[PDB]
Amino acid sequence: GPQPISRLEQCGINANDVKKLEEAGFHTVEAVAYAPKKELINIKGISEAKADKILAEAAKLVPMGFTTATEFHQRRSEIIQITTGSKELDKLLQGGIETGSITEMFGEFRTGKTQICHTLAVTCQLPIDRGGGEGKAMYIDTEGTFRPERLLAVAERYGLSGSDVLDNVAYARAFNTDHQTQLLYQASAMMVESRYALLIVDSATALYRTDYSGRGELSARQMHLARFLRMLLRLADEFGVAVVITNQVVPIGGNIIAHASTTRLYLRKGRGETRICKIYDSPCLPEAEAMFAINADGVGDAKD
């Protein structure tokens, strides 16, 4: 995976600058390789020449040039996709949910988004041959809906160790936008020493609906949301995790969330426990419909 920031100390950078970068937020070399010189200058104890040297050393360690499309195709042919537990959804998504890209699921009030998030969180720890990724899951709730009993019930279906499953899912809650942003830095610091395969942010843009109800305060809300999405994309690129976010339709979030998201899914109520999932936006998937139901076990095919 990513190379730890300790490599720069060996490369020639003194330990004090490495500590300054670590306390700044950069942890895995590629974090400072992807950052502009302005961000490095913003650090209180780094000069322009020091920033230039650090950027050159970081660029010397990672490839940041041109390459053919054959190499990219070969690299992408081994991208890990995480299953959802439903055969129809797996067929619709052509394998499952891809890593390294942001996926957004949105719908009406209580249309089954949190159940999908729980199923993804429990299934991301499965072995690859069974459709998992062998990685710890991080769950960032902001509405207070995390129910561990659902995790126990769904893990009973696959027969995994419930205590081990609950030990492999980090949990956090945010009360305002600033804490939500700082949780991203905490996750970036935490992901260095452990293997994470799936990061979940629950229904987002909800705090921006209420905390930013003013008329002239809209621009700050939009800018903060854009920065949050950019940080999410940076994390997904850096650690190769499948960021799954959630949204709710009443619009105040705007087109920023739609542009930033790579794959979007639309969920609507059906008949009984059956619900409809429709691909809303994707660069490589056609529009289609799928039937899925949420039973007591979790998320699965609509059995009739």
Ligand X SMILES: Nc1ncnc2c1ncn2[C@@H]1O[C@H](COP(=O)(O)OP(=O)(O)OP(=O)(O)O)[C@@H](O)[C@H]1O
Residues 6+ apart with CB under 8 A from 49: none
159 is in an annotated binding site: no
Residues 270-299 that bind Mg ion (CB under 5 A): none
Residue 289 CB-half CA count within 13 A? 7
Q: Please tell me whether 177 is known to bind a ligand.
A: no
Q: Using the 8-state DSSP alphabet, how is residue 2 labeled?
A: P
* Continuous segment of H or E residues that includes residue 203: strand 196-203
Single residue of 2, 25, 240, 254 touching a second copy by CB under 8 A: 254
Residues that bind ligand X (CB under 6 A): 109-115, 143, 145, 259, 281-287, 294, 296
Q: What is the dihedral of CA 257, 97, 274, 166, to 10 degrees?
A: -100
Quick one: which of 82, 86, 117, 93 has its CA closest to 288? Answer: 93
Q: Which does 112 bind (CB under 5 to 8 A by kind): ligand X, Mg ion, a second copy, none?
A: ligand X
Structure tokens at 70: 């054959």
Determine if residue 113 is labeled as part of a ligand binding site: yes
Query: Using CB under 8 A, which of the segments 5-13, 45-53, 124-132, 146-154 binds a second copy?
Result: 146-154
From first CA to last CA, the distance across the chain in angstroms is 44
Nearer to Mg ion, 114 or 205 (CB): 114
Residue 283 contacts a second copy per CB under 8 A? yes
Choose the contact partner of 11 out of Ca ion, Mg ion, a second copy, none; CB within 5 to 8 A by kind.
Answer: none
Q: Which is nearer to a second copy, 16 or 161 (CB)?
A: 161
Query: Sheet of 274-281: strands edge to edge?
Result: 169-173, 136-141, 196-203, 242-248, 102-107, 263-269, 274-281, 289-294, 299-300
Q: Tokens 């537990």 sit at which residue? A: 85
Q: Which of 28, 83, 114, 248 binds Mg ion (CB under 5 A)?
A: 114
Closest CA to 291 of 132, 156, 22, 91: 91
Among 10, 12, 38, 49, binds a second copy (CB under 8 A): 38
Joined together, the tokens standing for residue 75 give 């690299």
Tell me the window of 60-68, 108-116, 149-157, 173-181 that interacts with Ca ion (CB under 5 A).
108-116
Q: Which of 67, 109, 127, 296 binds Ca ion (CB under 5 A)?
A: 109
Tell me which of 28, 125, 177, 188 binds a second copy, using CB under 8 A. Answer: 177
Tokens 């970068």 correspond to 21
Which helix (H) or strand (E) element contains residue 50? helix 48-61
Query: CB of residue 202 vs Ca ion: minimum separation in angstroms?
Result: 12
Rg (CA), the chain: 21
Within 279-298, the residues that bind Ca ion by CB under 5 A are: 281
Residue 120, interface with a second copy (CB under 8 A)?
no
Q: Does 127 bind a second copy (CB under 8 A)?
A: no
Q: Which does 230 bind (CB under 5 to 8 A by kind): Mg ion, Ca ion, a second copy, none?
A: a second copy
Question: Which positions lie near Ca ion, rule CB under 5 A?
Answer: 109, 261, 281
Question: Which positions lie near Mg ion, rule CB under 5 A?
Answer: 114
Which residues line the annotated binding site for ATP? 107-114
